[model samples]
Structure formats: structure tokens, C-alpha cells
Target chain A: NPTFHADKPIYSQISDWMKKQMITGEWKGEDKLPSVREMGVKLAVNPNTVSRAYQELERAGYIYAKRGMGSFVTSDKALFDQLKKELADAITERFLEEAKSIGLDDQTAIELLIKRSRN
Target chain B: NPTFHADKPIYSQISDWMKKQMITGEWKGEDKLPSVREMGVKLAVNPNTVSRAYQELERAGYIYAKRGMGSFVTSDKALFDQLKKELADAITERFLEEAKSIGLDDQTAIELLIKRSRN
Candidate 1:
């Protein structure tokens, strides 16, 4: 196991790290973060890939860029509220998919929970 | 990998040898006697496999006759008439199939001759 498994791109993983930063954010308002150059050196990563992550954040309505300041967090309160439900939905969708491989669908998946709850 | 080291059945090999005897015209068409059991010990073969090869010869229009009597060649002259052409056709198809592995269609293979004939 040489660190990366299955295969997500380097830039996409970096984008996710910044997204989770919001979930971990103590203050969910306008603020700047580590610059692309700073994060590149800190993570020992390629600076262009770090900049790619920054570009994705700006594009996704999660953050916005300033003239010289790089990026500051967005006040998109909808994403701030919507993000938690969306992530949990991803977890449930994966569960549903795995269950389907053994010939069960959402209805049977629902039935199994009530059966397993007493245990 | 086990008790036998062969790419084909001894029966089929025996059949090919018998056919080659005719194709090479070494005493083609007429035969007198050779007992199956005696030939079995001579070849160190399973007598049943030898008999199967005999059956295949009899099944083809190649030879016909009695028990313990060696297969005498048929008077069916069509095989003698067409055998050489059919054999060479097989050889050419193998060449065409080898050419296909190098991405040459049969048409392109003829084009290779066009450039070669000038040189």
C-alpha cells in the first residue's frame, strides 16, 4: 500500500480537504486560509495542483477570490447548511450500492434495519 | 505437466502419419496386414487410442476393411486429386493470419509485394 488506494486524483482530494475545513470551521464566515504556495510547501505538494483545488472551491460557490488576497471563504449559507446532509447522503448511497450487489434494494435495506435494531 | 507431455492426442498424430504416407505416395493405396495389438506394443501406445485413430481413418473416406487388417487406402481419387492444393491453402491461411497480427489486411499484404517486386 503506497499511500494512495483505489484512485482519486490528487487535486480532487485537495479540494475535499478544503471543503471539510468548513465542516471543521469554528467560525463559518468570511475568512482567508493558507495560500496555494504556503499549502504546497506545507503539504509537500505541487503548487499547480493546490491552485487547482483553490479554483474548484471558487467555482463551486464555496469560496471566492480577491484581487491579490487569493481566496476568502464565501457566505453561501446554503452550502454551509446543505453540506452536512449531502455528505451523509453519500454515505447512505454507498451503503445502498453495496447492499444491491447481494441482490437487495432500498426496500429490503429498509427492512433489515428494523430487524437488526433489537440486536 | 503430468504423465504425458504432448500437444495432441497420439491417435490424431497416428492419423496424420498415415495420411502423410499416402501424400508422400510411399506405398499409397494398398496394404495387407498388421495386427492392432502388435502395433500397440511397437509404438508403446494405448491400444485403445491406436484403435481410435483407426476408427477416424475408417470414418473418413480414406480406407476400408477387416479386423486386425491394416487400413488399405480407398480408391477415392478425389483426395489425391485435391490434397496438395488443400494443404497449401492451409499454409497460406496461416501466413495471412500471422500478417493480421502486424495490422495488415490481406489487401495490404499484396501491396507489400508491389514494393518488393521492383527491388
Candidate 2:
């Protein structure tokens, strides 16, 4: 439903879009998503793309589907808290990789980050 | 004379390669470079690309040219010292941008990194 960085996969972009909507409370717990074909038609995207987004979210426990009904956002109160932790884990892993590439250990990376932030 | 990440510009890779040689003392103070045409033909790359790298090094005070004898690595004692600081600033600025994208301030980002490192 919004602009995307086209360099990345469209389905991944859609996945991020849906995640942000959930984070902002625009999509609440137990809320049903627009069906795969519905959003695909609306966004002028391949229906498979929307299905892929839902599939990944479901795998991550972010969403679930009923046999006959559509996908629903997880109703668990801990959903958003888990999201934040997962996001931090992902970012930190990438950051650690980048830091290590130039000869920094995790401890030293943190130290440098701290010292650099002060100035 | 080494492998490069072809995804980036050849000139930038050449620049980085040159800088590392300077950092390691492989290219010491007052060391003369292979003339642009020499390396270009040796590597079978465009002469202008090699020239671009030399131009950038001169711009950054890392190297200088003698009008007729060709380019030389800088004799500046602080050259490598400044390189580390510049590298940190570049990496940190990027880290801050990524952190901020997901609702983290620099302080909070550091906190999260520390906390994540523990687990």
C-alpha cells in the first residue's frame, strides 16, 4: 500500500510494509489481512507475491491462516515485543559482521561505538 | 594486483588497494607508483580508471606526483592514523542511520548492541 525500494524483492518489500503496519497499530491483533488476490489486484502485483509475503510472516509466527478464512495478525500481546528483539538481533548481527571485517571484536566494536558517539 | 569486489567501481577498488599498500609500508614514503599506463595495461583496465585512483589519492594528500617522475606515496607520519578515524566515522554514520530507521537513538542503539552481545 506504499512506495518500496525496488532494488529488493517486491514480496520482501510487501512483507516489511505489513510488519510496519502491525508495529504502528494500523493492523491490530486478530485482524484479517486483505486476501492474496485482493491486494495483488489492488497493488497490481502478482498474486504469488502477496502469498509469499504472508507465507514468510506465517513462518515467523507474525501471521496465521484459517483453512477457509484469510490470514490474521497474531493476537499475542508479546508480538510487538518479540518484533523489537528480532529486529535488534538482525541489525546487530550485520553490524558485528561489518565491524569484524575491519578488525574489530564485539567488545572493541562496542567500545569504539561508545567513544565515537561522544564526539 | 589482487582480487577486487567487481560489484564496485574498479577505480575505487584500485584506490583502496593503493591505500592498504601505503598503510602496510609496502608503498613507503616517496615510493613511486607504476605509471598509470603501465598498471592499466598490466591489469588490462582502462587507463583513465587508474588515473582516477591516483587523482583521488593526491586529493586526499595520501600521494603526490613529481611532474615528470610520476606519483609518490605521502611521507606524512599521520597518514595511516587519519585513515582509521575516517573509516570509523564512515562505518559509524552508516550504523547510526540503520539504527535510527527502526526507532533507535544512538544511545539506545549502543545499549541494544551491548545487551544483544551478551545473549
Candidate 3:
């Protein structure tokens, strides 16, 4: 198994990993996930943690629960598209903020960006 | 021009964008950079921000200054290798930590990773 290390909260890491899998189509849409208890034992982690990660994943539209059966992937393209766009926007906004902090006006910042893109 | 958004420090975003350019070969080795004032105007940001970004860039070995001429890219493969490794490590570490939190230990985490990677 591959190691998982994260700088932020542990749950965030789990979310990221799961999201990555979903994005790459590894855990296909509507695929059932292992029970919280099972995953906890398998990963040597706290069940609460697994539950928390699952809860978040479900909230984020990556997975859904079927009342009695189990949780499964959403298989919703609209949600995925929204999530991807949001991520990209956040990244670009970060770039703009950084450019401002460095005393770069919008025009020069854009120029540098364009120049860099060309390269 | 595209917007920049980040969840981290502005400087970090700038660094990331600059590095992205370098990794993609957009900013080739030893490339000359514009002066602080010039870039600031172009980017619609402050000179200080641009200066800070440049300072950080130089410190990180992405760009270097030649006495009086100007700042240029380092043309160092080793530096690039180190940066790439550090980024990958950080990302992976985050993933593992999350897996553990979710009650998934090394084996299960790795299995998940492999499963995801194949997709």
C-alpha cells in the first residue's frame, strides 16, 4: 500500500485521496465503499476518523448513502464539473493575490503570466 | 488575463505559478526577468509585491542575479529535481495522514492508491 501524508487536518487528506480516486475514475460512480468499521481496521485508524471522512465525502457530493445498503459514488457529472471549476478558480485567485503582494500591477502580472504561458 | 486565487499565502501562489512555468519549460534556463517596477506595472500590483516574489524566487534558485545586469533563471537540474520531490512528498504525506485518519492503514491505503492509480 502507498503511504498517505498530509500537512493539513487528517480528514482533509482522506477527502483529497478519495476525491483524487473519484476524479481519476478509480472508484467508479455508484461503487459501494467499504464500511467504516472495515476501513478503520484495515488502515489501523480510528473508526470515528473514517466516519468523519466519509461524512465529508458524502456532503461534498463525491459519495452518497442508500438508506440501508451502503454508501456509493454519486456518478454525477455536474457536481464534478462544479468542483473542478471551483478548484481552478481558487488556484487562479491565489495567483492574483500573490502578484499583488509582489507589487505587480494587473497588467504586468498578466503580461508575465502570458509570457510564462508562452514558454 | 486569468485571475489568481489561492488558499495559502500569496507568496506561495506566486512561487507555485513561477515553478509551473519552469517545469513546463515556458521559462527556460537562465532566462532574464523584467525589473521590479516594470513587472509591477504590468501586473497591476505593487512593486513591493513583485520584489518580494522575485526575492523569494531568487532564494529558491529558480532565478539568480548577475551583479548589475539582471536576474536570470538558474539552469540547474538538481534544484528542479529537489523542488519536484519536495512537492510530491508533501502531497503524498498529506494523503497517508488522511488515510490513517479515515481508519485506513498502510496496506488498505496502498491498495486504494493502486486501485486509483490504475484508473
Candidate 4:
């Protein structure tokens, strides 16, 4: 079971987790999401918390809610692709900043990255 | 100027910022840290927040508090070195996890890392 971090709000973290799922293709385009109550039960959180997460995700265009049915992942391939690239770019930028702070030049950082990936 | 994120506590973020400085060698061993009030004014936060951050850092062995003087970075090179490695390892793990989620194999990830580093 995924546990929430103390540093961030549970609802925001839930939204972030869902976004990662979409970015990783775990939740593919047009995939139907679990109902708020179901996800609340699954995550052991309040239904309202899950609802808030769903609302945020819908607002961000990651998912959309149907009147009587349920929310579904965005079918826009371009948006999904963009999200994936954006996630990767953000992670890469953070890594580069940390590596540079530790006195690793770009070439050396790349070398370390290659060496580390093998192990 | 550093801004606190809504997702994290300001005190904890301050501690994190200080640790990053130590890991990057921006705050070298035996360096005297800014006074609590000074840092509070600089960061536009309460003195208590700075004090809490300093207390946590001291507890973590990153800094030491003197009787009459002020807090100073630990003079232990070994601890400092370990902190640097630990920070790098944590960030690398995060990057690796994200890369894997995006379906990048180790080799391809390394190649991409190299390409991204140059630009």
C-alpha cells in the first residue's frame, strides 16, 4: 500500500501519484478511473479526500468526469506525451542541479550516470 | 531568495536547504552558520523557524551549537563526505525510478542523460 508523506497534503500527493500513473502509462488514454469512494477505500483515506484529488486532476485536464458514469483519463495523445516529457525533464533538471552542486561537471555527471545505470 | 513550498514545512525545508549547502560545499566544515535572528530576517520567517531548523541540523550532526558562540558546521570530514554521498544516492534513486517508469532501459536512460547534460 502506498503511504502518504508527512511533508505534503494527502490530497495533493494523491493527485501527484495519479499523475505519475498517467505519465507512466499505467493509466492509459481513455481509461476509466475508480470511483472516489472506491479509491478512498483502497487508499484508506476519506472519500472527500479522494474527491478533492479527482477534482484537481479533472481541473488539470488529466481526467474528466461524466455526469452519471465516472472519470476517464484524457484521450488526447499529445497531452499524455507532453506530460510524460515534462515529468522526465523535471526529474532530469533536479538531478543535474544536485550533481553540479556536488562538483560534478556535465561530462563527469554523464559518466557517473552511465556507470551507475549499469549497477 | 528561497521560497518555502506549500507542500512542506518551512522549518524542515530550511533544514533541507542547509543540508544541501553542506553537501555542495557551499557551507564548508567548521563554518559558522548565520544567527537564528539573522537567518529569520533574511528568509522573512520567524526566529523560531530558524531555531527549529538549526536544532534539527544539530541533531543530525550537521552542525554543533556552542555555549556562548554560535552554531558551526561539524568539523568532521567523514560525516560531511557521507552526507554528500547520501544526498547524491537519494536523488539518483529518484531519477532511476522515474526513468524506469517511463519505460527507459538502463542503457537508453544513460544515453539520454548524456544527451541532456550537453544541452
Candidate 4's DockQ: 0.40
Candidate 2 lDDT, B1-118, residue by residue in tens? 7565545788998888787677656778998889999989887889999999889989989998888889888898686767855665667777776665555568878987898788
Go through the candidates in order and give each one's C-alpha lDDT. Answer: 0.60, 0.79, 0.65, 0.81
For candidate 1, write residues A1-119 as lDDT tens digits.
01222246778877776676675464366887778999888877889988998899888888887788777888876777577445544444444444433334445444343333322
Error of 2 at A111 (Å): 4.6
Cα-lDDT of candidate 3: 0.65
Q: Which stretches of candidate 3 lie over 4 Å from their true place?
A: A1-119, B1-7, B41-44
Q: Lowest lDDT 10-mer window, candidate 4 chain B?
A: B103-112
Writing each residue's lDDT as its tens digit, candidate 1 over B88-114 gives 344444434444433344454433433
Candidate 3 chain B weakest ten by summed lDDT: B110-119
| Candidate number of the best DockQ | 4
| Lowest summed lDDT window (length 10), candidate 1 chain B | B110-119
lDDT of 3 by residue, A1-119 (tens): 22455445666666767776775566778888889898778767678988899999887778889999989988987877566445444444544454443334445444443433344
Per-residue CA lDDT of model 4 for B49-72, tens digit only, reads 999999999898889988989999
Off by over 4 Å in 1: A1-6, A103-119, B1-119
How many pairs in model 2 have backbone atoms within 3 A of each other, for residues 3 or more apart or on separate chains, i.e. clashes?
A: 0
TM-score result, candidate 2: 0.59
Off by more than 4 A, model 2: A1-10, A13-27, A31-51, A66-70, A77-83, A102-112, A115-119, B1-55, B63-73, B77-80, B104-108, B115-119
Model with the higher TM-score, candidate 2 or 3: 2
Ordering by lDDT = 4, 2, 3, 1
**DockQ scores of all models, one per candidate:** 0.01, 0.28, 0.04, 0.40
